């Protein structure tokens, strides 16, 4: 009941997600440096793609007061009545003191000190419960230090509203442990299968208005770039996903769209100046009924080059999956698609023809 | 000619010698060759004569000597005769013409001018290029190359006090690097053995090739 | 809604864009060094070509004060009135103190530390807004430390003036997040298809997100002309010859690059154009049969020897191919 997905994808000379100083994130694995793409970056691209198709828009935000007030201004409330209303909706859930808010000094509504994760209809429903108590809200705004007047039970029931991204990825909320939903997809960091050094890239910004005695360069910097063949991996705990979603057909659609978004998407980090859109050169989905398993140890011994890295990495993942399969025997399902018809990958199962076909047969075969 | 890799260190812990100046540096380069022949003609390029390339200057100096006389280890040097030593013939595989061979050329692009209150002077600067023209103009129809001109500073040279030993001046050196194309074998051969440009005792001139 | 373009172009023994020390920029791809041309360089050549034909002159500069003062001096203002005027135009915009400036010199007019990207009519209109308040500017110049007096609303609306190069490539301005437009064309670096440690056969790729481009420009005909001129400038221009293979594909799901096809370097002693062509073909075919999709594909070639099947229907020439593809989009 664990849908594991492995994929070898080669990204060209780019910088997917830089560190806090420009450099690409790097691991020290098997002794050698290896540029990596953080898990949260791919998870963000994936969710934006899944929710893109499945238009649920599971917006993660802080300024919920701003949007509740915006919905109330759309529905007839005055600016001050809407703002005070939203502040009542946020202040009427937090146990013992309402939802903590960062010190607010501005003309804009305050931003909650904790990040919420909700779909758009949930915000709409909050504005609805706020609209049903117009007079009460005005009565609290009349005071100097108002308190909660809203029926915390139902608004608390609206904050617990799940979603496809909420079901898969999970939510956290310290001030409301009743709404915390547990994630069902284990997403792993993507490290190269071969040691890569970071190549500093010098670059200047030329000015369009020259002055004699100078060639006229308007700026200079140096952004750190790196290329390589990344290995990627992710697990989908079907059981907990069916628990969160509740139904099994909706769950099936969510996991199928998840796998397709996991293969399809690529982050948007400094990609405008360097197009790194690509597809995984090897895709291996396996359905395991005992425990999820990663093929990361196969890539501990870094790969030396001067040759290509796709074929060697592919056949080496094959070897490791074969020996691992014959050392931890298990009744699992295995399938793989590949963008190279040279070698024959036996241990990965039955070679499907294309990515969506593999995904269809595996999501179906998973139950 | 032949090739060797060497690394000279400072004599004592107070940098009394040798890296303190350039005159002592080249002094440590000629001391290693006791016997020296010197035949001159009315203004050709000099063949006496050693050639060396400084790679890095952060570990007392990293240097590569290619020359004809055998280099001999001296005080405060590597733990052996080298770092490394071997012979090399520009005759090997003939260095076939029309075939590509990489290269690494040092230089000092200059143009001479009359200066006021002079006693004419040479000047390291000759908008839109001029050093490409200069080196491919000196670079007669032998192995043509590419021209990696830079725009920075600087190199200094002062005397340690010995007589007949250049004093203090500055000079720029351009580090061109690429893949030579051979259009004439004996011309590029003799041009590499002679050294390209004046001041062969200050690093300029040395050319090294490579295979595809 | 993604116009993808691939092209194999053999650049001769030269030095397109040198590094910070003269050497050509190099990648370490598939273990081997590969000379490359930075994306910012081709983007610069391309834009200069686009603006060349479409004479918009999307001047990217820092010295906006100097030119605003020049427009004001052409329109009658004195040197000091023009200079102080321009400084009022810049100092009345954002974040409580106007756009920050570099360490001023004793005589030259300063230059904003941030860098601007505007067309020429934008500068002209900014000087126009400065001229409508002559008396105000002169009155402020009488003080020792002046402040903003200009109507930041309209000048801020003039800084938001887009352009073909602004629409495609996008703009950024930290002190003015209201004018920040996001680019719609993803331009990739051009690396050789064979290890070289200067001539060679560079591979190039670029994407044009039609959707966002029609969003920035607004109209759809301007968008069509802008993308057509973009493609022609992408093939035509060369930094300071035509590509031996050109493949435009229109995809409706996601853009895709063929860079992984060229990861395993190609050994030579033979030619590299045919090898690169047939290998890009092979990779496009297997990739096409592994990621099935309803897309449009077209390609031109300057050699009628091979037949590239997976690349679509072989048009006759670059302008015909570009016309039929922009049309099909």
């Amino acid at each position: 009941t664990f849908v594991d997905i492995h994929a070898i994808q080669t990204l060209p000379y780019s910088n997917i997600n830089r560190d806090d100083l420009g450099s690409p994130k790097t691991v020290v694995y098997g002794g050698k440096e290896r540029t990596r793409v953080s898990s949260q970056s791919w998870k963000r691209a994936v969710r934006h793609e899944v929710e893109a198709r499945l238009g649920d828009k599971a917006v993660r935000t802080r300024r919920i007061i701003s949007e509740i007030a915006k919905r109330l201004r759309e529905r007839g409330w005055d600016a001050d009545l809407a703002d005070a209303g939203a502040r009542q909706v946020v202040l009427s859930v937090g146990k013992k003191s309402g939802i903590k808010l960062e010190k607010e000094k501005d003309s804009e509504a305050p931003a909650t000190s904790v990040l919420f994760y909700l779909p758009v209809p949930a915000i709409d429903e909050l504005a609805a419960i706020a609209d049903e108590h117009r007079d009460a809200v005005a009565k609290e705004a009349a005071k100097k230090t108002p308190k909660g007047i809203l029926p915390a039970d139902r608004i608390t029931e609206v904050l617990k509203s799940r979603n496809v991204s909420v079901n898969l990825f999970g939510r956290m909320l310290a001030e409301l442990p009743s709404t915390e939903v547990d994630g069902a997809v284990q997403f792993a960091h993507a490290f190269t299968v071969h040691g890569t050094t970071v190549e500093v890239d010098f670059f200047t910004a030329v000015d369009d208005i020259p002055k004699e005695n100078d060639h006229g360069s308007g700026h200079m910097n140096a952004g750190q770039f790196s290329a390589g063949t990344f290995y990627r991996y992710a697990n989908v705990n079907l059981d907990r996903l069916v628990e969160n979603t509740g139904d099994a057909q909706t769950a099936r659609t969510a996991v199928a769209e998840f796998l397709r978004a996991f293969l399809s998407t690529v982050p948007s980090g400094k990609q405008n100046a360097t197009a790194a859109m690509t597809l995984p050169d090897l895709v291996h989905i396996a359905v395991r009924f005992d425990r999820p398993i990663s093929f990361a140890p196969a890539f501990e011994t870094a790969l030396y080059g001067s040759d290509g890295y796709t074929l060697r990495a592919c056949q080496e993942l094959n070897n490791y999956a074969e020996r691992l399969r014959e050392v931890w025997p298990d009744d699992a399902i295995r399938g793989y698609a590949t963008v190279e018809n040279k070698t024959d990958l036996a241990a990965l199962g039955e070679r499907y023809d294309s990515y969506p076909a593999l995904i269809d047969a595996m999501v179906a075969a998973a139950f | 000619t032949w090739l060797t890799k060497i690394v000279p260190d400072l004599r004592y812990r107070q940098t009394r010698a040798d890296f303190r100046t350039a005159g002592n540096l080249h002094r440590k380069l000629i001391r290693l060759s006791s016997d020296l022949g010197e035949e001159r003609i009315a203004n050709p390029r000099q063949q006496s004569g050693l050639l060396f390339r400084i790679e890095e200057t952060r570990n007392e100096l990293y240097l590569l000597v290619q020359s004809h006389s055998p280099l001999r280890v001296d005080r405060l040097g590597p733990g052996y005769h080298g770092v490394q030593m071997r012979n090399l013939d520009p005759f090997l595989a003939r260095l076939d013409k029309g075939s590509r061979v990489r290269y690494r050329i040092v230089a000092s692009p200059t143009k001479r001018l009359g200066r006021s209150e002079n006693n004419t002077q040479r000047l390291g600067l000759k908008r839109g290029a001029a050093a490409e023209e200069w080196w491919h103009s000196r670079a007669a129809a032998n192995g043509l190359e590419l021209l990696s001109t830079y725009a920075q500073t600087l190199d200094d040279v002062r005397d340690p006090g010995t007589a007949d030993r250049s004093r203090k001046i500055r000079h720029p050196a351009v580090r061109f690097d690429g893949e030579a194309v051979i259009s004439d074998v004996d011309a590029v051969r003799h041009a590499v053995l002679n050294g390209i440009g004046r001041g062969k005792s200050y690093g300029c001139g040395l050319l090294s090739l490579a295979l595809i």
Side-chain angles (χ1 to χ4, degrees), chain A, chain B residues 1-45 47-57 59-111 113-121 123-126 128-136 138-141 143-168 170-212:
Chain A
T1 61
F2 291 101
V3 177
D4 306 338
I5 184 164
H6 307 84
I8 301 301
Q9 183 181 4
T10 73
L11 278 77
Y13 178 80
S14 65
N15 190 359
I16 298 300
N17 47 7
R18 76 195 77 185
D19 200 358
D20 198 3
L21 291 174
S23 299
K25 297 178 181 180
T26 59
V27 193
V28 296
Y29 200 68
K32 290 176 72 175
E33 294 286 333
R34 293 185 186 184
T35 64
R36 68 165 164 93
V37 173
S38 65
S39 67
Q40 60 269 18
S41 64
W42 271 355
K43 285 175 71 175
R44 183 179 181 271
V46 169
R47 71 178 182 91
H48 282 287
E49 205 282 333
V50 174
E51 76 184 1
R53 288 184 179 179
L54 273 298
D56 294 330
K57 296 294 290 183
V59 176
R60 180 172 290 172
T61 176
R62 291 172 63 192
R63 312 168 186 92
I64 59 172
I65 303 170
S66 178
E67 269 197 348
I68 291 170
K70 185 185 287 185
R71 298 291 189 272
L72 292 168
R73 287 188 292 114
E74 287 179 354
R75 294 175 65 184
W77 288 12
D78 194 359
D80 196 1
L81 272 298
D83 193 0
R87 185 175 292 114
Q88 287 297 107
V89 180
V90 181
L91 194 144
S92 65
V93 286
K95 297 186 285 186
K96 175 77 173 71
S97 179
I99 295 297
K100 184 175 182 292
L101 297 173
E102 183 68 27
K103 60 176 288 184
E104 184 267 331
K105 299 292 187 291
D106 271 332
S107 179
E108 292 84 3
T112 62
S113 296
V114 62
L115 279 76
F116 286 97
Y117 192 70
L118 295 172
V120 298
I123 299 170
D124 194 359
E125 290 179 354
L126 287 174
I129 300 169
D131 195 2
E132 293 181 354
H133 285 170
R134 292 171 63 95
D135 54 355
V137 171
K139 181 67 177 177
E140 288 292 328
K143 293 182 181 180
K144 61 182 183 294
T145 60
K147 63 179 71 175
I149 50 171
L150 276 299
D153 192 2
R154 61 183 179 180
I155 61 174
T156 298
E157 187 179 1
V158 174
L159 297 174
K160 289 191 287 184
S161 66
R162 292 176 176 89
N163 192 358
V164 64
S165 296
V166 174
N167 289 318
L168 274 72
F169 291 161
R171 190 198 295 117
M172 183 195 289
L173 191 55
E175 296 88 359
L176 282 84
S178 66
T179 190
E180 291 181 353
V181 63
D182 50 356
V185 63
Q186 293 179 357
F187 209 89
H189 291 283
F191 57 88
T192 68
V193 309
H194 66 285
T196 61
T197 61
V198 178
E199 56 270 18
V200 179
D201 176 70
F202 180 78
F203 67 92
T204 189
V206 72
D207 196 77
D208 202 3
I209 298 172
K211 283 177 66 179
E212 284 80 5
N213 292 318
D214 189 359
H215 298 89
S217 81
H219 191 202
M220 281 88 68
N221 272 326
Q224 287 75 241
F225 290 161
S226 65
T229 185
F230 297 160
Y231 161 70
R232 63 195 296 166
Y233 167 76
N235 297 321
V236 175
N237 191 359
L238 291 174
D239 195 1
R240 189 177 296 118
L241 188 154
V242 178
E243 182 180 1
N244 291 319
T245 60
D247 288 330
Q249 188 268 330
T250 302
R252 182 175 179 177
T253 303
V255 59
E257 292 293 328
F258 171 71
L259 295 175
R260 189 172 181 177
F262 172 75
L263 298 179
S264 178
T265 198
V266 167
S268 66
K270 195 189 283 186
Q271 200 177 12
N272 195 1
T274 185
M277 305 300 284
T278 300
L279 260 66
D281 284 334
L282 182 146
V283 174
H284 179 200
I285 295 89
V287 176
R288 295 185 63 85
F289 299 99
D290 60 356
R291 73 176 303 281
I293 190 167
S294 66
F295 288 164
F299 294 149
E300 181 172 358
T301 67
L303 296 174
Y304 59 92
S306 297
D307 288 329
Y309 289 108
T310 65
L311 193 147
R312 296 179 68 186
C314 291
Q315 67 184 358
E316 198 274 330
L317 190 147
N318 189 7
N319 291 317
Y320 182 73
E322 184 176 1
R323 57 194 67 190
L324 180 142
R325 183 177 179 270
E326 70 184 1
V327 73
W328 185 253
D330 189 7
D331 191 0
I333 303 169
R334 291 176 181 88
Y336 78 103
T338 308
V339 177
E340 57 90 18
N341 295 317
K342 279 82 173 177
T343 61
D344 288 331
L345 307 174
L348 300 184
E350 55 271 15
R351 186 175 182 178
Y352 286 91
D353 196 2
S354 66
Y355 294 166
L358 171 58
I359 296 166
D360 286 331
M362 286 300 159
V363 68
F367 64 95
Chain B
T1 187
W2 63 278
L3 194 66
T4 176
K5 284 188 72 68
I6 58 168
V7 172
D9 293 329
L10 72 166
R11 304 295 100 185
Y12 294 100
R13 296 177 182 176
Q14 292 181 356
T15 183
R16 294 179 181 177
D18 55 357
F19 186 67
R20 72 184 187 277
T21 187
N24 193 357
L25 192 151
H26 184 71
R27 185 178 67 85
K28 306 297 283 295
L29 286 175
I30 62 171
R31 60 157 174 78
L32 61 83
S33 60
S34 65
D35 292 331
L36 284 173
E38 185 175 1
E39 183 177 1
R40 292 179 290 175
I41 304 170
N43 292 317
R45 293 182 178 179
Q47 180 182 358
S48 297
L50 281 76
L51 289 175
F52 65 97
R53 181 73 185 89
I54 52 170
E55 294 178 354
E56 278 85 4
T57 171
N59 183 9
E60 265 35 61
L61 183 63
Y62 279 155
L63 188 153
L64 177 65
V65 166
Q66 182 169 358
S67 65
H68 66 90
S69 292
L71 193 149
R72 185 171 291 276
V73 66
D74 288 331
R75 292 171 61 250
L76 271 298
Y80 288 102
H81 68 88
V83 178
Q84 76 178 3
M85 287 183 178
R86 69 179 182 178
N87 291 318
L88 193 148
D89 291 331
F91 182 76
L92 190 146
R94 282 290 309 275
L95 276 296
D96 196 3
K97 64 181 179 68
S99 66
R100 298 177 71 186
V101 297
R102 294 186 177 94
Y103 73 92
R104 183 189 301 166
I105 62 171
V106 297
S108 175
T110 51
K111 185 172 74 173
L113 275 300
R115 189 183 290 169
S116 179
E117 67 186 2
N118 279 110
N119 188 359
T120 187
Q121 61 84 30
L123 189 153
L125 300 186
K126 184 177 180 180
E132 190 272 331
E133 194 273 331
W134 176 77
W135 189 78
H136 85 76
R138 271 57 186 189
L144 293 174
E145 295 177 354
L146 188 62
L147 282 151
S148 163
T149 299
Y150 85 109
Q152 290 174 356
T153 57
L154 179 142
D155 197 354
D156 194 1
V157 57
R158 67 176 65 88
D159 62 345
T162 310
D164 196 73
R165 187 178 296 275
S166 179
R167 79 161 25 244
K168 187 196 299 292
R170 62 95 176 172
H171 69 90
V174 191
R175 181 180 181 271
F176 304 111
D177 189 358
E179 182 180 1
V181 65
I182 302 171
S183 179
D184 193 355
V185 64
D186 58 356
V188 65
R189 173 180 174 178
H190 183 65
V192 171
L193 188 153
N194 288 124
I196 303 168
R198 68 178 187 178
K200 297 179 181 65
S201 66
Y202 289 164
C204 297
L206 184 55
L207 177 60
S208 296
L209 294 175
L211 188 153
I212 52 171

